[PDB]
């Protein structure tokens, strides 16, 4: 494989810097390991070991264990909220103390990893939500790509009527809620305080539940949306750009990628930023830190960013990445790459509080499933969510 190549690289190494990640397979995993092999080849017995830990939630659970055992890897993927938690432990090294150079890096991703003036993460695999669509099925019924939230709902109801089933496919999770929430004018923080049960949150959870009843919105409860394609007519999903190639290779129809429907034609909708930043832990040996520095400079390089971004659909984190010829060759051939970049300009983050991982999954994500799947009243599922959260915070 690639993992076999790396283990052999790491066996004849003097210094190994462990990189713990939440890639379970497909392109994120291949493209991460192909990049590590190139780095390991270019070094003289200095080496990065990538250790898959399962997914992002398994990943944060394994870093929590590591803090109890007091044995941290050199490097890990981390969200903004994961970084918050590891900083409460003062467990992370400031990235510019390594003199890792950060100019070029898009403010969007860079602002998100700076805490009290100080950067503690390197943006590595950053995604934006886009509107995936079935170009064949819009073209057939003469339905334009919808620009605004109102045209998106019209278009959904029209194509579901025409084709005999619900055409807007989604996962009833916090990530999909955030697209409708953010675009009905919603905000997580009000005067310093977390709110999950605001008028915009009920509006967004009520829009999704209305969609299910009305036969235009399809909950996917088993696998990614792209893994369910070919069961019933599909027109639309709002899904991470990091699935881009997995939709490409799954879809038996002509795939489209558009910017998100917004409130008005004046401006695309906001997408949620997902994916992770690379952090380096203080308990790593100076030798291990030296490898971390070099690895981080590699992954920020235009070529390695070009090859990552093009293999997956993640957003290139630098200016220099868009001016690389491998990127410019992929994009001159496939306009969905410039769509994903154009969508990266209209980008919102979940709140970066340490406890937000727990909250997004077991509380706000449980309130979304109770409404969509068990017909709980939207306001009553988010009133519960907000109390459980307030009791945790
Ligand atoms: N732990 C933790 N997780 C978080 C947080 N915020 C968001 N999420 C999770 O981030 C994923 C989005 O991040 P992204 O890197 O953009 O995308 C993932 C995969 O989703 C995507 N993928 C893979 C296969 C496929 O067929 N389709 C496809 O889209 O590939 C990438 C690597 O696996 C969501 C997905 C989830 O893990 O299932 C639950 C959500 C947080 O704060 N903490």
| Ligand 1 mean position, distance from CA 288 (Å) | 28
Say yes or no: 109 and 178 in one domain.
no
Contacts of 101 (CB under 8 A, 6+ apart): 297, 300
Atom of ligand 1 nearest to the CA of 25: 33
Say yes or no: 174 and 294 in one domain.
no
Alpha carbon distances (Å) from 155 to 98, 141, 232, 265? 51, 10, 17, 16
CATH of the domain at 299: 3.40.190.10
Encoding tokens for residue 185?
């004018």
Q: Is the CB of 171 under 6 A from ligand 1?
A: no
Identify the sign of the CA torsion 104, 106, 109, 114. Answer: positive
Helix (H) or strand (E) holding 60: helix 56-69
Say yes or no: 306 and 360 in one domain.
no
Which candidate, 125, 126, 128, places its Cα nearest to that of 19? 125
Which residues on neighbouring strands pair with residue 29, listed in sequence order?
Answer: none
DSSP state of 245: H
Q: Where would I find the H helices in 99-195? A: 107-113, 135-140, 149-163, 174-183
Ranges of beta strands (E only) in 249-350 are 255-258, 271-280, 347-348
Encoding tokens for residue 149?
């939230």
Say yes or no: 263 and 114 in one domain.
no
Q: What is the rounded CA–CA span in Å between residue 291 and residue 293?
A: 5
Go through 138-162 and write b for each residue having 16 or more CB atoms within 10 A of its CB, e for each that does not.
beeeebebbbbbeebbebbbbbbee
DSSP state of 269: P
Which candidate, 283, 291, 321, 276, places its Cα nearest to that of 98? 291
Say yes or no: 115 and 178 in one domain.
no
- Cβ atoms of 239 and 247 within 8 Å: the answer is yes
Please state the length of the chain: 393
Say yes or no: 35 and 51 in one domain.
yes
Q: What is the rounded CA–CA span in Å between residue 210 and residue 202?
A: 12
Give the distance, in angstroms, between the CA of residue 188 and the centroid of all CA atoms in the same chain.
Answer: 18
Say yes or no: 308 and 377 in one domain.
no
Question: Do β-strands 271-280 and 255-258 pair in parallel, antiparallel, or remain unpaired?
Answer: unpaired
Which candidate, 279, 364, 274, places its Cα nearest to that of 315? 274
Tokens 């001016």, residue? 323
DSSP state of 120: -
Q: Is the CB of 80 under 6 A from ligand 1?
A: no
Q: What is the rounded CA–CA span in Å between residue 198 and residue 200?
A: 5
Atom of ligand 1 nearest to the CA of 171: 38
Phi-psi category of 260—alpha, beta or left, where left has phi over 0 and alpha has psi -120 to 50? beta
Say yes or no: 199 and 262 in one domain.
yes
Mutation probe of ligand 1 site: the residue of 52, 243, 308 with most atoms within 8 A of C-beta = 243
Residue 64 domain boundaries: 3-126+275-344
- Cβ atoms of 295 and 39 within 8 Å: the answer is yes
Q: What is the rounded CA–CA span in Å between residue 172 and residue 190?
A: 25
Question: Quick count: other Cβ atoms within 10 Å of Cβ 266?
Answer: 8
Q: For ligand 1, atom 22, which residue shows the shortest CA distance?
A: 243
Q: What is the rounded CA–CA span in Å between residue 80 and residue 119?
A: 11
Which candidate, 114, 120, 58, 55, places its Cα nearest to that of 86? 120
Q: Where would I find the H helices in 239-278? A: 244-250
Judged on CB neighbours under 10 Å (0-12, 13-18, 19+), 226 is buried
Say yes or no: 237 and 284 in one domain.
no
Helix (H) or strand (E) holding 211: helix 199-213
- Cβ atoms of 204 and 181 within 8 Å: the answer is yes
Tokens 């990530």, residue? 175
- Cβ atoms of 98 and 296 within 8 Å: the answer is yes
Encoding tokens for residue 265?
């034609």
Say yes or no: 222 and 182 in one domain.
yes
Q: What is the rounded CA–CA span in Å between residue 360 and residue 209?
A: 19
Encoding tokens for residue 284?
């790593």
Mutation probe of ligand 1 site: the residue of 240, 276, 340 with most atoms within 8 A of C-beta = 240
Q: What is the rounded CA–CA span in Å between residue 393 and residue 389?
A: 6
Long-range pairs of 171-174 with CB within 8 A, sequence gap ≥ 24: 171/219, 171/220, 171/224, 171/225, 172/208, 172/219, 172/221, 172/368, 172/369, 172/371, 172/372, 172/373, 173/365, 173/368, 174/350, 174/360, 174/361, 174/364, 174/365, 174/368
Q: For ligand 1, atom 40, which residue shows the shortest CA distance?
A: 175
Q: What is the rounded CA–CA span in Å between residue 274 and residue 360?
A: 13
Domain count, the chain: 2
Alpha carbon distances (Å) from 133 to 16, 290, 299, 312, 373? 43, 45, 31, 18, 24
Q: First and final CA of the chain: distance in angstroms?
A: 45
Which of 307, 328, 344 is the C-terminal boundary of a domain? 344
Which residues on neighbouring strands pair with residue 128, listed in sequence order?
Answer: 273
Q: What is the rounded CA–CA span in Å between residue 283 and residue 242?
A: 31
Say yes or no: 167 and 245 in one domain.
yes
Say yes or no: 161 and 204 in one domain.
yes
Which candidate, 349, 347, 340, places its Cα nearest to that of 321? 340
């Amino acid at each position: 494989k690639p993992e076999d190549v790396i283990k052999e690289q790491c066996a004849r190494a003097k210094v190994v810097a462990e990189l713990w990640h939440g890639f379970t397979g497909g392109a994120p995993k291949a493209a991460l390991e192909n990049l590590v092999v190139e780095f390991n080849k270019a070094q003289q017995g200095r080496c990065v070991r990538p250790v898959p830990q399962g997914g992002y939630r398994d990943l944060s659970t394994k870093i929590k264990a590591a803090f109890a055992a007091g044995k941290v890897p050199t490097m890990a993927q981390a969200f903004e909220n994961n970084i918050a938690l590891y900083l409460e432990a003062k467990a992370l090294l400031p990235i510019e103390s390594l003199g890792v150079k950060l100019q070029g890096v898009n403010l969007t991703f860079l602002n998100a990893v700076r805490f009290g003036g100080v950067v503690y993460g390197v943006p590595f695999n950053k995604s934006i939500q886009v509107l995936y669509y079935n170009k064949d099925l819009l073209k057939k019924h003469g339905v334009p790509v919808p620009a605004t939230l109102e045209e998106f709902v019209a278009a959904a109801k029209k194509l579901s009527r025409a084709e005999g089933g619900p055409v807007y496919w989604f996962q009833p999770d916090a990530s999909t809620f955030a697209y409708f929430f953010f675009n009905l004018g919603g905000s997580y923080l009000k005067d310093g305080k977390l709110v999950l049960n605001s008028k915009e949150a009920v509006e967004a959870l009520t829009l999704l539940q209305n969609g299910v009843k009305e036969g235009w919105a399809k909950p996917i409860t088993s696998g990614y949306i792209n893994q369910n394609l070919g069961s019933g007519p599909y027109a639309f999903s709002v899904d991470t750009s990091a699935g881009y190639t997995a939709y490409l290779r799954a879809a038996k129809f002509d795939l489209g990628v558009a910017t998100l429907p917004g409130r008005t034609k004046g401006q695309p909708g906001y997408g949620l930023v997902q994916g992770t930043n690379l952090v380096v832990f203080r308990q790593a040996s100076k030798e291990e830190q030296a490898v971390a520095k070099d690895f981080l400079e590699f992954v920020l390089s235009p070529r390695a960013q070009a090859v990552f971004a093009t293999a997956t659909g993640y957003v290139p984190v630098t200016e220099g990445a868009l001016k690389d010829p491998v990127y410019q060759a992929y994009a001159a051939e496939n306009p969905d790459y410039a769509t994903i970049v154009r969508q990266s300009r209209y980008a919102k983050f979940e709140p970066a509080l340490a406890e937000w991982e727990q909250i997004r999954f077991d509380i706000l994500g449980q309130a979304i499933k109770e409404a969509i799947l068990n017909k709980a009243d939207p306001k009553a599922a988010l009133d519960r969510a907000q109390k459980l959260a307030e009791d945790l915070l």
